[PDB]
Ligand SMILES: Nc1ncnc2c1ncn2[C@@H]1O[C@H](COP(=O)(O)OP(=O)(O)NP(=O)(O)O)[C@@H](O)[C@H]1O
Ligand SMILES: Nc1ncnc2c1ncn2[C@@H]1O[C@H](COP(=O)(O)OP(=O)(O)NP(=O)(O)O)[C@@H](O)[C@H]1O
Ligand SMILES: Cc1cn([C@H]2CC[C@@H](COP(=O)(O)O)O2)c(=O)[nH]c1=O
Ligand SMILES: Cc1cn([C@H]2CC[C@@H](COP(=O)(O)O)O2)c(=O)[nH]c1=O
C-alpha cells in the first residue's frame with residue numbers, strides 16, 4: 152500500500168513550512184508513516200550552490216540556476232520512490248511548481264521551457280496551494296520583493312489550470328491551527344483514496 | 356562583424372579535441388580572432404561535479420547529471436555571446452548534441468526530454484560531425500564502452516535529421532593533417548558567410 156506524495160505550494164510567507172511540519176507531526180500521531188521533505192534540499196552539493204545563490208553570496212546565470220533547482224529534485228527521486236513504495240507518505244515543502252513559477256517570473260522565460268526539466272518527476276497525489284493576499288504575506292533572500300512575488304503568483308495561477316493535477320486551494324489567512332486542520336483533512340483523504348492508483352509522472 | 360560559433364562533435368576518439376585545437380591555431384595564424392571552448396567545462400563548480408561523475412569518483416542520478424551538463428553550457432552563454440559579438444569565432448569541442456546523444460543512449464530517456472534543457476542556447480553556425488567507424492575509434496571514464504557508444508551514435512544520427520542546423524560530415528579516418536584541412540576550409544566558409552545573419556537559438 153503505497154504512501155501519498157503531498158506537496159505544499161504558495162507565495163512567500165503563506166505558511167508552507169509551518170504547515171508542512173505540523174502535517175507530518177499530525178499524520179504520524181494518527182498512526183501513519185509520514186516524512187517531511189523540502190525543496191531546495193540544501194544539504195547536497197547542488198543544494199549548497201542553490202543556497203549560496205538565494206543568499207546572494209553567489210550569482211548564477213538564470214537558466215543554469217533553473218536547471219540546478221530541477222536537478223536537486225531529481226537527485227531525490229530514488230529516495231522518494233523508495234519511501235512511497237514502502238508505504239511512507241511524503242509531505243513536501245515546495246516542489247516543481249515553485250521551480251516553474253519563480254524562473255517563469257523572470258523576463259524571457261516561457262512556462263513551457265521552465266516545465267521541461269521537471270517533466271517525469273514523481274507526480275504529487277495532492278498539491279495544496281496556500282492562498283494569502285500578497286499584502287498579508289508581507290505582514291508576517293533573492294526574489295523577496297513584491298513585484299517579483301506578484302509575477303510568480305501569476306505563474307502559479309497558470310499552473311493551476313492543469314487539470315491533470317489534484318490542486319486544492321487552502322485559505323491560508325486563517326490561524327495556524329485552522330489552516331492545519333483544513334490541510335490535515337485533505338491529506339487524510341488523499342492518503343486513503345489517491346493511493347489506489349500507481350504513482351504518476353509529472354507533466355507527461 | 357560577429358564571429359562564428361563552430362562546434363565539433365563525433366563519437367569518442369574521432370579527433371574532436373585534436374581538430375578543435377588545430378582549427379583555432381590555424382584560424383589565428385590566418386588573421387582571425389578565434390578561441391577554443393570545450394564541454395563539459397570542468398573548471399566551474401558544476402564542471403567539477405561533472406568531472407567527478409565521468410571519472411566514476413561519484414555517482415549522480417541520470418536526470419540530475421543530464422541537467423548539470425546543460426547548466427554547464429548555460430553558465431558560459433554570457434561569455435559566448437560577448438565573444439561572438441566582439442568578432443571572436445568560437446571553436447567548441449562538444450556541445451548540446453553530445454549532451455543529448457549520451458543521455459539519450461540510456462534507457463528510458465527520450466530525445467525530446469533530453470533536448471529541452473538546451474533549447475535556446477546559442478545556435479552553432481556550423482556543426483562538424485567527425486565520422487569514424489566505431490572499430491577504428493577503438494584502435495586509437497564513464498560511457499567508454501562499445502555498446503554504449505553505438506547507442507550514442509544512433510542518437511547523433513537522429514539529431515542530424517534536423518535541417519535547422521548546418522551539419523557537415525567530416526571523414527575523420529584520414530590523417531590528422533588531411534582532416535584538419537577539410538575542417539579548416541569548411542570553417543573559413545562559415546566565418547565569412549554564416550555570420551551575415553544574427554546568432555540563432557538552438558532548437559527553437
Ligand atoms: N496562518 C498563519 N497566521 C499567522 N502567521 C502565520 C501563519 N502561518 C505561518 N505564520 C507565520 O508567518 C511566518 C512565515 O511562516 P512560514 O511557515 O515560514 O511560511 P513559508 O510559506 O514557508 N515562507 P517562505 O519559505 O519564506 O515562503 C512565520 O513567522 C510563521 O510563524
Ligand atoms: N585522424 C587521426 N588519425 C589517427 N589518430 C588520430 C587522428 N586524430 C586523432 N588521433 C589520435 O586519437 C586519439 C584521440 O584523439 P582526440 O583528438 O583526443 O579525439 P577525441 O575525439 O577528442 N576523443 P574523446 O574526447 O575521448 O571522444 C589521440 O591519441 C589522437 O592523437
Ligand atoms: C523549489 C524552488 C524554489 N525556488 C525559490 C523560491 C523560494 C526559494 C527557496 O526558499 P527557502 O529559502 O525558503 O528554502 O527558492 C526556486 O526559485 N526554484 C525552485 O525550484
Ligand atoms: C558535453 C557532454 C559530454 N558528455 C559526455 C561525453 C563525453 C564526456 C566528456 O569527455 P571529456 O572527458 O573528453 O571532456 O562526457 C555528456 O554525457 N554530456 C554532455 O553534455
Ligand SMILES: [Mg+2]
Pocket residue numbers: 167168169244
Ligand atoms: Mg518556508
Ligand SMILES: [Mg+2]
Pocket residue numbers: none
Ligand atoms: Mg515540448
Ligand SMILES: [Mg+2]
Pocket residue numbers: 371372373448
Ligand atoms: Mg576529446
